[PDB]
Design a protein around this nucleic acid. Structure first.
Ligand SMILES: [Mg+2]
Lengths: 1316, 623
DNA sequence: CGTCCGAAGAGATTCAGAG
DNA sequence: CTCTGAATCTCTTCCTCGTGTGGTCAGGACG
RNA sequence: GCAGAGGUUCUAGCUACACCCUCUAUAAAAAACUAAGGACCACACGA
């Protein structure tokens, strides 16, 4: 079965591998994340709830006052998305929050409250995301990109190599929290374990143990293994265990139980260990010289006086041995030191550490944290407990605790957010073990250590910041507050929380201005995964490691779609099938592999557990039983590609498109072109400008439909049915009876967005894709949005391309374009400009907007209306006047020079209080008329639908066809119908219609007030006039045109069609590319794409030939079936007999322009399949044909390659780039060019160009262009007067920038002057 | 915004400080930018330029001419006339662009030739047209590359731009004497296709009166472009004291090589156009033309050779296709042998005969051997497989395949860049640089496995990040090099210093990396060189070593030549001309004054972007 | 109506080993 | 016991130009 | 045409980069005409 719109033009899909999992909703990463944030979560986890619950204690200091959160509910947005975008206001929901204030009696903490005050308070103003997963901040559609940052937890880095400049590897452990203070435990080059908290001065890390209420004895009991020594008559008989002898040297002669085991100079072999274990030796005599090298563990005092004979952790000498022997210390505890692995590291720190008590440790920590002031014991204790033992000032998220327990190999998954003594000692023990050799350091770039912070998590963090900021003020106010003297609304204000949220959403390191020029651009910018951002590595601070792709990126982050330049690999996109785990990690679908069967069950796997199993390659053949036909299959066990037997395999890739993202998946033959060319092609697809009439690509991937549907550019059908009425501005869908709810179903109305200004000044145009009466199913495409054709993403426009040099006009990378392309408007793109005029307050009276402008001609004022605003639809040109504004004593807005076009609409916003001019009244009246017309249209349409609902029910059980036509349709409650459930349904519809009639005038009045009320504007402005200019930029020499395979070039010449190379058929090639760019830049995919497009157009031409002549539908059906079969078995498998025999004609007419072919990313068309496809048509199997010269007329030898490759048109048009300037306004430093942009500017003759002129014998052109052309005011004036005089003579003078430098150096206090 | 606020020292230091932002290099007026266009019809002394850009840049000149001719009484009326773009304004504009050079300027001006002068040719459009030859000098693409145009104002500025900065005056790069305007990518391919031969081509065998008859036969279509035919040529040589003598002979050649003969100037011999004429051959041709004919004949010859190369590359139709890249028939058996060998090595490791390290080394070695074998098989299939007759039984010739012609000619491509298309792509390394044990066996003509493409994108991301870091490192190095320099200019003409450095061809254990001919060329000796005959003044003490002297040195078999080094110069606050040597951009001694510190710094720093980041003694030959 | 609140190297700075 | 060399700590950049956007001391009321 | 004002237009026009005429304390026979301001930080992208 196929969808009806798919029946219109069904895409020939290659790919032998059968798909098991349908492509997920590409915008899930944003929509699902925000649905988690704004949702009311009863569990109070993950949402505005956790944020309120985490910060709602409100405990007064000795005031018995408490305020608690009870519930909240986001209000309905004041303005709809379209209304907020046109007004410039944010799309936000008022945050109705219900709060309960309770006051307890004094000195009665356990007593009940004396009064309860519950009320709903408006705090904050939280913006919402549209159905397309994008915010609207200030009239701009702004999207928040998900941030990939190092997850909270513990990571044992190395910093191997450069440190200490001796090859000695250091080891450090960072306790990175979600919010709080970092805690790094580093090693001194002399193997001393230091602590570095918040990257402050290095400190002996043993001080933190003392700060955690631990003495030396406890520290050595935790971090070292006690060895018991017994004083005996036989020279202090020593107790040794078998395990401690492994890896030891010949310390002495081991003789126990009157038997010798190991002699002098004999290594302790495992055989010796086994035989002494069989003998079970426990006590071994040791020479007194050996104990000198041991270190005491615990303190010892004599039993007579109790004085300190020997403290803990110092070397033992002969005098110490004599003192402990004479005292009578029978039991002696010593540390087990093994320089091989179990080396001493805490002991060295304790030698370095001069602190012996917890108070001294706290004092030193305070000194190293807050120096310059005398610390206090209470102050130090408070600082430490607020720094590590306090939830408010320090917290690890559930992901942080999970990572902590993963790295520490703990058992529990969850735990307290704050740390503890056990956590610190466990981290130190693991760091010590890493130093010893057991265990391995972790990789920061691993996706198991870098989670993804979505928009919901960022918004929750900013909300928590706002809540704590207002909590500080509430606590401060409540200290002196009085009970029962105020409403629970004065202490909390929406101002700071709203300011924080608005600042985050509008101006942030991550609040990216959405590049809304392509559906692919929107779909890949909302899925963008940036490492940069708040709480993230910066570009300069980012290492080479982070930029560079990790083996664990497979299936999680696309390794092909990254922005080249300053941030390469830092803003990498997310692969098509990857989804974010509930802890922020990146999962990946993976088919479970059973005993030998590749089972269809899809198990999402994170990066940490991917290594544990072995992953099979997607390009592994199966025998339809899940059995690899392939006894050894290539696999990815631990990030290493290696052949594995079938029985070894534990998991398989979900499909062949897993690794690539949506931006890189749409490139056909991605398996052929080079990775750099693939990267550039994926990047350039995001910046193609929509053509006027977008058309499907002849060769594609099959994800274009998925990208177009998933993105919000098109108008998908939420409910199926039939198209009752279709219009270029609206589409009405009559929902089917089996797809509509019993109540309030009616029919669906879709208001397609007409020509609207976009973020990159392009047209967001939606054209209907259906006619009247066309059946439509659920989730179907109805309107072809920008760069969309028949529900398929149509970025550019495919055309004939011949690969051959042509007189140098395609010299190295330039593109040659025929006159035929320009003639048929293939690349004419509508650009909507936003020329906004503002009337601010001015001294000595304000400025008017009337048409009275002095020192101007009547011709310029002819376009403007009587009130000084350009007539809608007027075709203005460069330098023309749009709206007449004169300042009090000629500041009217004018079209910028060069740009032209016709005004599409002029919207005016006027603040309340100032009377609106004639044009504003006319526009407001037309807006009211349009709103009333739309409301009446929906009134009549929904009334017709509801009557059809009623009439259909009234065909049985009291049917009166004649009686219905008699009485007017307004009243039907008097009709006689059986007292059954049908009568109840009619009564329900009648009551609903009555309530709707009551609400109709209310909402109409609300709309009238919305269009009447003065729109909020910036302070000190009268009214703002926005004029939208539609520029139709045709293709021109210099316009940057680029295909999908990384081949980019500027159009050199628009060559007349008569000069184009034509084949024997006479059809001239539309574009003549350069073959020389194929071998070096290995974009060989474009050659495969060219051949497949040639085959597709051959099929289309055969269909056209058998369609232009009146042929039987049987011939069309058999040819279409032959085309869709195409030899080698494919997943497509479309049968033409199941069609209705008249939609076959529609299909053939839709394939007249070319056969649509889908080439999946990594299992697309092979060379044999393409050759067979060429053989299907009249075209040769070689793919290249003889072409005759356009001018000479004789065929080119060595027949050239032609085909219809899908090449885009990037938005880097030459029209934008022209920046010529002679003289203009100057800067502060008096550098004349004034930072060239829209502002009329000269290009920075930078330091490199100055060096270049210095290398030449240039001292006059350089001098003129560094002095008289740039900043010398007298010099500039004299040069201008001289050139207009005709004498090109330079009056040198001196650059004013040097005078500025002299003044700045003098202002420092350094006299710098010149000698005369 | 919680950011450090700029102080009185933050605006005197750093990139954004007053020095490097407003004094060292400052924005200028009379400047415009646009994307660039090829426009092969131009000559390198001129460039295309849009009408709007010429109107805006030359506004003061247009105002002055309007005032002089009385079209507008006042600047104000003339400015209104320029806004109206009245037809009279365009005619005035054509007068101020007759001989007014403009300085084409690409943004990353790495070396001296980054900015060059051009006579603007008014074109309708909005894209600057840059001559194809100077694109290599500019390192400029046609992929959205934009370059600024600056208008010299004063007579001194325009005059020195014409005399020095013109592309006609910049033929040899300052880094080395080799030409910089050499046919680079497409014209070289056209010449290479032109100068070849089929062993059996249409119109092969008949004798031709001259190049005119060769053109007549080719254009009429009755003789193939490259067919081995004897032609009669009037080869001109200047073996006399500047006089050109004529030598007429029947040199066996092809039609295509005879076509180029009318392009080359008189002085050049025919032995330079009788080869396949790749990139290196054309570079040597242009260098010989510059060293023999001079500058103007070299410019005219370069323009004509560009024209013919483009025209006959268009006529060639040197396309690219799937059948143009051939898979070796032995590639499958080489892959099978490599798989068998790695299986044997793994089996040996499993038993324990070979541990991990030696197993890894063995696998890497055998995979490299298989890669070399498949590369050789690919080259044999790509240059030897071609079978074509000679009106007889059987013969084998050098291939005319599209990719082989586009790679062997040096037009664009290399050995690895052609291996990655038909042969095994090779062992591809991980981010850390350690080689993946199992290579990317599949090539680009065939598909790539998902893991194979993952390793490929590992390498590609490594290369892209390396380039991104390396361009910044090279820019910093260029800045340091320029600034340790820029006080060193040629202040004197000679110092009479006998000191110097003994120039000797460099040997690093292998063959001669650089012969003494190309190492001492253009430098003035310090003491008289002598041949095996003692007390022989083969070259006097203070004579510049031009091409003739170096050629004489090779045939006299000199070993070490003491030469005057700039280090040994005793001149204060500069160096003398003799101690420096040839300008490396003009065929004469360095001019007294020219700044050579900045030239040297730019020459050193320009290839920084092209750099990278990471027994027994046996006699070789008889002697 | 105006006015007062990572990384990479160099060099200085401790800092230390050995008679 | 006073310097020696050596580890430690602190400074100083770390390309070069374009083109679109958006955010920015924020005195505030009283004589 | 260098310090000011007036003139036929259109409040005001004396070279202000700036457009016509008069003279040194007085205002009109006269058509082409008029305006001299403007930073930093972030994001994305191109080479
Ligand atoms: Mg380029």
């Amino acid at each position: 079965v196929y969808s009806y719109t798919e029946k219109k033009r069904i895409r020939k899909d290659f790919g032998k591998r059968p798909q098991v999992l349908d492509v997920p909703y590409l915008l899930s990463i944003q929509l699902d994340s925000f649905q988690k944030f704004i949702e009311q979560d009863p569990e109070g986890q993950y949402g505005l709830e956790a944020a309120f619950r985490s910060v709602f204690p409100i405990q007064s200091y000795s005031g018995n006052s408490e305020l608690q959160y009870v519930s909240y509910r986001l209000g309905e947005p004041v303005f709809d998305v379209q209304e907020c975008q046109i007004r410039g206001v944010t799309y936000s929901a008022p945050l109705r929050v219900k709060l309960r204030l309770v006051i307890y009696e004094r000195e009665a903490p356990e007593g009940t409250v004396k009064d309860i005050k519950e009320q709903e308070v408006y705090m904050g103003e939280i913006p919402l995301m549209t159905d397309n997963g994008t915010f609207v901040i200030n009239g701009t559609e702004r999207v928040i990109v998900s941030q990939l940052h190092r997850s909270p937890g513990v990571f044992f880095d190395s910093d191997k190599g450069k440190t200490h400049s001796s090859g000695k590897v250091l080891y450090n452990a960072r306790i990175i929290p979600y919010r709080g203070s970092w805690l790094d435990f580093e090693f001194d080059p002399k193997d001393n374990l230091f602590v570095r908290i918040d990257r402050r001065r290095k400190l002996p890390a043993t001080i933190i143990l003392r700060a955690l209420n631990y003495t030396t004895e406890q520290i050595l009991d935790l971090f070292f293994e006690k060895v018991i020594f017994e004083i005996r008559d036989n020279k202090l008989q020593m107790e040794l265990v078998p395990e401690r002898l492994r890896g030891e040297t010949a310390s002495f002669d081991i003789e126990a139980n009157g038997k010798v085991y190991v002699e002098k100079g004999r290594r302790i072999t495992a055989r010796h260990i086994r035989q002494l274990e069989k003998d079970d030796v426990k006590l071994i005599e040791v020479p007194v010289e050996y104990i000198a090298g041991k270190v005491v563990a615990k303190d010892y005092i004599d039993e007579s006086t109790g004085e300190l004979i020997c403290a803990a952790n110092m070397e033992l000498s002969l005098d110490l041995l004599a003192k402990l022997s004479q005292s009578g210390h029978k039991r002696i505890e010593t540390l087990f030191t093994n320089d091989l692995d179990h080396g001493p590291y805490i002991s060295e720190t304790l030698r370095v550490d001069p602190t012996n008590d917890r108070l001294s440790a706290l004092v030193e920590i305070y000194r190293m944290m807050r120096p310059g002031e005398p610390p206090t014991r209470e102050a130090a204790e408070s600082l430490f407990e607020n720094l590590f033992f306090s939830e408010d000032r320090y917290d690890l998220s559930a992901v942080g605790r999970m990572k902590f327990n993963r790295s520490l190999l703990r058992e529990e998954i969850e735990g307290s957010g704050i740390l503890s003594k056990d956590d610190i000692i466990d981290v130190m023990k693991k760091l010590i073990d890493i130093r010893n050799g057991k265990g391995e350091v972790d990789d920061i770039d691993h996706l198991g250590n870098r989670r993804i912070r979505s928009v919901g998590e960022m918004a929750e963090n900013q909300f928590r910041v706002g809540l704590v900021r207002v909590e500080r003020a509430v606590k401060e106010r409540l200290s002196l507050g009085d009970l029962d003297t105020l409403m629970p609304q004065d202490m909390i204000n929406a101002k700071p929380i709203s300011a924080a949220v608005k600042e985050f959403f509008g101006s942030s390191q991550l609040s990216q201005f959405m590049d809304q020029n392509n559906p692919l651009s929107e779909i890949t910018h909302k899925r963008r995964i940036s490492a940069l951002g708040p709480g993230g590595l910066t570009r300069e601070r980012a290492g080479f490691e982070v930029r560079d792709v990790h083996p664990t990126h497979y299936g999680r982050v696309c390794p092909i779609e990254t922005p080249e330049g300053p941030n390469i690999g830092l803003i990498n996109s997310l692969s098509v099938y990857a989804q974010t785990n509930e802890y922020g990690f990146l999962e990946t679908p993976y088919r479970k592999v059973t005993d030998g069967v590749v089972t269809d069950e899809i198990h999402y796997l994170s990066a940490i557990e991917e290594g544990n199993y072995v992953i099979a390659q997607a390009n592994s053949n199966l025998d339809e039983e899940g059995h690899f036909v392939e006894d050894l299959v290539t696999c990815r066990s631990k990030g290493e590609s290696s052949l594995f037997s079938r029985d070894q395999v534990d998991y398989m890739d979900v499909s062949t498109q897993q690794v690539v993202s949506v931006g890189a998946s749409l490139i056909p033959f991605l398996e052929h072109d080079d990775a750099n060319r693939a990267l550039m092609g994926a990047n350039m697809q995001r910046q193609a400008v929509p053509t006027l009439r977008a058309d499907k690509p002849l060769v594609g991937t099959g994800m274009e439909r998925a990208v177009a549907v998933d993105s919000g550019v098109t108008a998908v059908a939420k409910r199926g049915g039939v198209v009752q009425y279709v219009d270029a501005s609206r589409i009405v869908i009559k929902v089917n009876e089996d797809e509509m709810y019993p109540g309030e179903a009616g029919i669906d109305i879709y208001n397609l967005t007409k020509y609207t200004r976009s973020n990159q000044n392009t047209c967001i145009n939606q054209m209907p894709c259906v006619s009247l009466g066309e059946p439509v199913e659920r989730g179907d495409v109805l309107a072809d949005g920008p760069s969309t054709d028949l529900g398929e993403l149509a970025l550019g426009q495919n055309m004939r391309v011949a690969f051959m040099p042509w007189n140098g006009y395609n010299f190295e990378d330039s593109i040659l374009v025929s006159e035929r392309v320009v003639q048929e408007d293939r690349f004419t793109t509508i650009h909507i400009q936003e020329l906004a005029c503002v009337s601010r307050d001015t001294k000595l009276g304000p400025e008017e907007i009337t048409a009275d402008i002095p020192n101007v001609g009547e011709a310029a004022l002819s376009k403007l209306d009587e009130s000084g605003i350009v007539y809608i639809g007027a075709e203005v040109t460069g330098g023309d006047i749009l709206v007449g504004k004169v300042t009090p004593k000629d500041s009217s807005l004018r079209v910028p020079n060069g740009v032209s076009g016709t005004v599409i609409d002029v919207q005016v916003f006027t603040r309340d209080g100032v009377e609106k001019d004639k044009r504003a009244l006319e526009i407001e009246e037309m807006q009211l008329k349009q709103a009333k017309k739309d409301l009446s249209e929906e009134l009549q349409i929904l009334e017709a639908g509801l009557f059809s609902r009623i009439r259909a029910v009234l065909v049985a059980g009291g049917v009166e066809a004649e009686k219905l036509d008699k009485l007017p349709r307004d009243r039907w409650l008097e009709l006689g119908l059986t007292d059954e459930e049908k009568q109840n349904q009619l009564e329900q519809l009648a009551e609903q219609y009555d309530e709707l009639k009551h609400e109709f005038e209310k909402k109409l009045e609300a709309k009238r007030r919305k269009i009447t009320q003065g729109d909020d504007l910036a302070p000190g402005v009268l009214k703002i006039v926005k004029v939208y200019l539609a520029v139709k930029r045709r293709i021109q020499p210099g316009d940057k045109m680029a295909g999908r395979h990384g081949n980019k070039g500027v159009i050199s010449k628009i060559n007349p069609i008569e000069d184009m190379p034509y084949d024997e058929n006479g059809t001239p090639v539309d574009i003549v590319l350069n073959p020389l760019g194929v071998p070096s830049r290995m974009n060989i995919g474009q050659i495969l794409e060219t051949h497949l497009g040639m085959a597709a157009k051959g099929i289309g031409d055969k269909i056209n030939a058998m369609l232009k002549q009146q042929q039987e539908v049987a011939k069309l059906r058999e040819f279409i079936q032959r085309a869709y079969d195409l030899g080698a078995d494919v997943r497509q498998k479309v049968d033409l007999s199941t069609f209705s025999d008249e939609e076959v004609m529609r299909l053939a007419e839709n394939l007249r322009k070319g056969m649509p072919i889908a080439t999946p990313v990594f299992d697309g068309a092979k060379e044999a399949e393409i050759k067979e496809l060429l053989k299907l048509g009249d075209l040769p199997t070689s793919g290249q044909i003889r072409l005759y010269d356009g001018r000479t007329g004789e065929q080119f030898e060595r027949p050239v390659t032609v085909g219809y490759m899908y090449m885009l048109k990037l938005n880097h048009l030459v029209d934008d780039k022209m920046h010529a300037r002679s003289t203009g306004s100057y800067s502060l430093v008096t550098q004349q060019p004034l930072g060239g942009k829209a502002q009329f500017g000269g290009q920075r003759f930078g330091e490199m160009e100055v060096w270049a002129l210095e290398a030449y014998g240039a001292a006059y052109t350089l001098q003129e262009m560094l002095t008289v052309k740039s900043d010398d005011v007298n010099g500039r004036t004299k040069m201008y007067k001289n050139i207009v005089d005709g004498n090109h003579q330079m009056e040198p003078g001196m650059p004013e920038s040097f005078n500025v430098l002299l003044k700045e150096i003098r202002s420092l206090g350094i006299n710098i002057e010149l000698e005369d | 915004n919680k950011r450090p606020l700029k102080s009185l020292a933050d605006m005197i230091k750093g990139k954004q400080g007053r020095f490097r932002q407003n004094l060292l290099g400052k924005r200028v007026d009379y400047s415009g930018r646009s994307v660039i266009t090829v426009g092969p019809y131009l000559r390198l002394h001129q460039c295309g330029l849009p009408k709007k850009m010429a109107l805006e840049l030359f506004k003061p000149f247009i105002y002055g001419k309007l005032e002089l001719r009385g079209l507008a009484t006042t600047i104000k009326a003339a400015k209104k006339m320029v806004e109206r773009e009245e037809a009279v304004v365009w005619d005035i504009l054509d007068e101020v662009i007759r001989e007014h050079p403009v300085l084409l300027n690409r943004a990353p001006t790495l070396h001296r030739l980054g900015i060059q002068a051009f006579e603007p040719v008014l074109i309708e459009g909005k894209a600057i047209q840059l001559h194809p030859l100077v694109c290599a000098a500019y390192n400029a693409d046609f992929d959205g590359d934009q370059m600024a145009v600056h208008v010299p104002l004063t007579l001194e500025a325009q005059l020195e731009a014409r005399a020095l900065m013109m592309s006609t005056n910049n033929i040899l790069s300052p880094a080395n004497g080799e030409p910089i305007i050499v046919p680079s990518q497409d014209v070289v391919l056209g010449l290479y296709y032109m100068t070849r031969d089929c062993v059996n081509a249409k119109g092969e065998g008949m004798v031709l009166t001259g190049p005119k008859e060769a053109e007549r036969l080719y254009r009429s279509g009755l003789a193939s472009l490259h067919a081995r035919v004897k032609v009669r040529i009037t080869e001109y040589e200047k073996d006399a004291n500047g006089e050109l003598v004529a030598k007429t002979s029947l040199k066996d050649t092809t039609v295509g090589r005879a076509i180029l003969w009318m392009i080359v100037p008189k002085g050049l011999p025919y032995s330079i156009v009788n080869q396949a004429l790749g990139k290196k051959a054309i570079s040597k041709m242009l260098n010989t033309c510059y060293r023999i004919l001079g500058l103007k004949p070299t410019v005219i010859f370069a323009d004509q050779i560009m024209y013919t190369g483009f025209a006959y590359a268009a006529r060639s139709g040197a396309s690219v296709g799937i059948d143009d890249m051939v898979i070796p028939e032995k590639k499958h058996e080489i892959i099978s042998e490599a798989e068998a060998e790695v299986a044997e090595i793994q089996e040996q490791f499993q038993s324990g005969l070979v541990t991990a390290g030696e197993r890894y080394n063995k696998v890497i070695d055998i995979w490299a051997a298989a890669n070399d074998r498949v590369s050789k098989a690919m080259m044999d299939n790509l240059q030897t497989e071609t079978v074509i007759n000679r009106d007889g039984q059987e013969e084998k010739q050098v291939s005319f395949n599209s990719i082989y012609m586009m790679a062997d000619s040096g037009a664009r491509g290399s050995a690895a860049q052609i291996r990655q298309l038909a042969g095994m792509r090779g062992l591809m390394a991980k981010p850390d640089g350690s080689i993946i044990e199992t290579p990317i066996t599949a090539n680009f003509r065939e598909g790539l496995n998902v893991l194979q493409y993952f390793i490929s994108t590992h390498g590609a991301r490594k290369g892209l990040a390396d380039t991104a870091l390396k361009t910044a490192n090279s820019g910093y190095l260029t800045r340091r090099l320029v600034d340790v320099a820029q006080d060193l200019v040629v202040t004197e003409d000679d110092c009479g210093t006998h000191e110097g450095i003994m120039m000797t061809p460099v040997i690093e254990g292998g063959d001669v990396k650089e012969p003494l001919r190309d190492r001492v060329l253009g430098r003035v000796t310090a003491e008289d060189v002598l041949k095996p005959g003692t007390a022989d003044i083969l070259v006097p003490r203070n004579t510049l070593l031009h091409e003739q002297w170096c050629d004489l040195l090779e045939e006299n078999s000199v070993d070490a030549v003491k030469v005057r080094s700039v280090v040994s110069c005793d001149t204060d606050f500069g160096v003398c001309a003799h101690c420096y040597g040839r300008d490396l951009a003009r065929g004469h001694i360095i001019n007294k004054g020219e700044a050579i510190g900045v030239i040297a710094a730019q020459s050193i720093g320009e290839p920084g972007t092209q750099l990278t980041m990471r027994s027994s003694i046996q006699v070789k030959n008889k002697g």
